[PDB]
Subunit: 336 residues, 4 copies
């Protein structure tokens, strides 16, 4: 009754997903594929700048490493169609490299003696179901071969936008996420391999504007909001931890207290609520996908009409990963 999982890309999301999977019964990781040797991967699992020391033992072995005595095979195949996942019983692959985040590319894992299903740890295109756990995981039926866990920002934005929309009716909106720098930025100014003149700049030494598709693509998660939102990011020098601001007009006039109460009423394991005046370091490592912050709510009313601002925190690392593993765990129970 345990589904065997493989991780392609033992990066920030891959390693934290591995960490969370150590505390759930329904799945286990039997194989990791990356581009390096087992000693590099074992060391990066054991020691983690932002998420702390690993909870357990890690011992490098020939061809893999042992976690609390259990051997995990490590391979270094650059091409997914060359990974023989089935040899190690792997049925579902977490595709966490950032290089195969579309249906046709992720399908490369599904070859003979490969895997059966793929969860992309990122937006995966419009022909792949895009799931924010506890907002729209109802759309899965288990027959899908490739699904998407969406982005960090989408998992933050979606429960907040859904709750506000259901209560008051979102007409239109603009989003800004103030976001930690990530591994797709350069450590120091240099050529960006994706052509982005702003991610080319030193990520820990600048406020860096950058594009994000979370608001424009929200219809994959909340169909009623298709075509109603847009937004962007300001990437700033913290190594993890982020926040999403959303400014909207609504069908109903509201008060600050009414907004905050509507968010609290929607709170659950994915969507948290706080009235404490926290800062970004306080959400590093949290398990909420989105933490609504009532201290930042604003309503600007002039001449009987309002602009409404709502703000939610997210650890783009652990908040996203908690949501990803919730979706993986659910998908594994229904996969067919």
């Amino acid at each position: 009754m345990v589904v065997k999982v493989g991780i392609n890309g033992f990066g920030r999301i891959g390693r934290l997903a591995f960490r969370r999977i150590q505390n759930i019964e329904g799945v286990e990781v039997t194989r990791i594929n990356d581009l390096t040797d087992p000693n590099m991967l074992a060391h990066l699992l054991k020691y983690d700048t932002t998420q702390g020391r690993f909870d357990g033992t890690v011992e490098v072995k020939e061809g893999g490493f042992e976690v609390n005595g259990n051997f995990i095979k490590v391979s270094a195949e650059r091409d997914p169609e060359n990974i023989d996942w089935a040899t190690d019983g792997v049925e579902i692959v977490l595709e966490a490299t950032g290089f195969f985040a579309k249906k046709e590319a992720a399908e490369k894992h599904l070859h003979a003696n490969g895997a059966k299903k793929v969860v992309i740890t990122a937006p995966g295109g419009n022909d792949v179901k895009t799931v924010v756990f506890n907002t729209n995981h109802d759309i899965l039926d288990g027959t899908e071969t490739v699904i998407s866990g969406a982005s960090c920002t989408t998992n933050c934005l979606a429960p907040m936008a859904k709750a506000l929309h259901d209560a008051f009716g979102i007409q239109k909106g603009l989003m800004t996420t103030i976001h930690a720098y990530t591994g797709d930025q350069m450590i120091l100014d240099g050529p960006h391999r994706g052509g982005d003149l702003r991610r080319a700049r030193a990520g820990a030494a600048n406020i860096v504007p950058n594009s994000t598709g979370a608001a424009k693509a929200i219809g994959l998660v909340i169909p009623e909001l298709n075509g109603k939102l847009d937004g962007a990011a300001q990437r700033v020098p913290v190594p993890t931890g982020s926040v999403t601001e959303l400014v909207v007009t609504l069908d109903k006039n509201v008060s600050v207290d009414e907004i905050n109460a509507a968010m609290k009423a929607a709170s659950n394991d994915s969507f948290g609520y706080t009235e404490d005046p926290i800062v970004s370091s306080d959400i590093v490592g949290v398990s909420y996908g989105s933490l609504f912050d009532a201290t930042q709510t604003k309503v600007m009313e002039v001449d009987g009409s309002q602009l409404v601002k709502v703000v939610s925190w997210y650890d783009n690392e652990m908040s996203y990963t908690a949501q990803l593993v919730r979706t993986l765990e659910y998908f594994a129970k229904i996969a067919k």
Copy 2:
């Protein structure tokens, strides 16, 4: 016809104001007051983490220091009433400590052996004239005893909001400034003397939400926008350099290109225009009070109505200081 100026508070703004005044003919600094000895102040003028080495020579002397051979007297009086500005011929004081930023407090400089006029390098309350150079410096007549150079954020916001309002009619708006950390934050978590639970946190290690009065108080500079705007800040880990986002509804529907063209048409020495995809380090040390970034403009249109987003950069240090010294120079020329 050269007006003698004193600086109270030889801090970030005080020292950079001194630097800019070295290239102005109409004013000269003859006296500095702070809380320390001349060697400390001379060293901090010569060496500057974010704004570079001083352009000239600085040499400590008895009771002050020489800048390019010219002696500047230094005193260390905590109470402005005890500063004998008149001994050094000072007529106008730049009040840059952060502790006397209101009319009655700034008037402490005005006494028999004191000065004649004060420019507060900060918001100064609603009963003193508040000037953003090249937006409303025509409200000065030279008879004022205390004026305000507004805040960094106000000098960024004002030319952008005025150009947008004049062209299209701002109905209501919300502002977020993503702002460099400043000296009123704690270097590491600890009790904040002002009672602010967020400025208590380590400023170079967090995204820190905090309040800002610039949007609400814009009516002191643009009277037609009184009651129309509000906003807040996200303080982030860069030691200087900031950006202001403004989301509004307007009386007229517009396009992105129409907005950008209206901003460019309003550009001058205070309000710059760029289409280059810059980041915060690129505006450190600039002399614009506000640098509009056309790459960040957005229009979100639903059902015939729009949200409009406009964004402008500012070096909260040198951009503000350039505006402050423009205002000081003008005020001194017409002073009576």
Copy 3:
């Protein structure tokens, strides 16, 4: 038989000491004195940028706050003579403000309605007993009224220097500690109240040389090394976490392996040993006072004589605090 403790200065060391005392049976904190209101102190206990969320509940009350339901009284007296420690049963005060770190100043806590004994959380001069737990806590007899827990650097240096000296005989040495920035540095360039032209500079944006008395003062802990060592610091942009390098000449020639084996043989709960290639974030929050890093050992031999380099990590916050509370617990158990 539980000794009641007060904390003067609920700062980085004061708050982390409180956290560690929650897991010690022999002492309990009944009173905190600082300069602010209880809401500020409660918030700073609950949320901590570098050391994570508090393990328990914290709730503000009238005149203090409750920790896991237990009320802690809070006062705000700037002068230690005015703190009525005895009202709350306090016998031993942790003097953690940084402003009373000498015998006569710490004695201000000792009066009719005050405390009985003081532990200074810092060097306290050459006339108070200076204790590094598990190196020289046997010098205490419990009759002392004022003792010192030494500095962070001393607690790192002492077990390493003692093991090396006992095995091989230290003749002379120089120390460099590459140290996290601390609260006595300015967040941005500005006048330093202590007159230090380098701690005046932006602490999270520079490599900052600064003085350290730990090596010169080591004779208070290891008398045989009086007059043999000196050193200095390079303060760098991490908010906590530090490392001590020591270069010596010895009475005996040695090999790298011989040095490392001597360190490992001396390891205990205070002095750890590692061969993993860790970085500073890996020691944040550790409970060793000193963690020897065998990967950094060097022997430079020319013409039959050697320079020897040994290196040990320390979290200047939690490593020091773990040592401080070990000493407090021991001192309270034998106090008379």
Copy 4:
């Protein structure tokens, strides 16, 4: 009388070398080769996080870009033997990619219709002359096909070690350089493509120990010191700017003043001298290869013998680049 130069690798050193070459008469850059398009390279030349805006105009064109109206060809050939340098008149190549830093690899530029000589902007192996300008550029005769400009640390260490050795006789020494992070570190924890478990860690969020060969290889520059020194690095979170500490024993006993005077006597355009208590931001952009800091000198004397500590600053970017371009300019005059 102008020698035409090509740059392979328009990175930190490549772009800053280009910037410095704009102010010297004897050489000009006619071709840049990297891995990207001209718009990326032009943008990175124009805007520079740590070294400021480019002094001039940059305009992208087809197949290259214009600098102050002069067209520079850009190509994107991954393999040096495929670059037809001679088509653009290039005689000397600055090999600044980091991927061809050995004689056999650098020689790939010297094929038919290629270049004539290569200067590696890094250590290049022991069969390549290794030059620190104004310390040993006398060893060049111009017949060499491949030479090395050494490392940043070597250019800092060498004039200081030479002056100390000539004056007093270095017996043995150990070096620690506290160094800015560089582009060979990961922005966030992840697999390091060189296998380095410490450069795998987030470079702007850690104190990172790492190896350096500058001390052990000093004999390539100062033959008398072969086999007498060793050392290592602590890489810390500043984006440029570094410092080198050296601890030695000498043939003569000395005083602090005697050491400082010997360094000042050796000062020139490459080796500067200061007594000001500066920090790392103060040496960003300087043109000295090495800036001796008299405030950090120490002499630890016990029982008639001494340990001696000397310390010099360097901008690992511009200090190294100034030295590199001095060597290039000299080599171009004598190349045959």
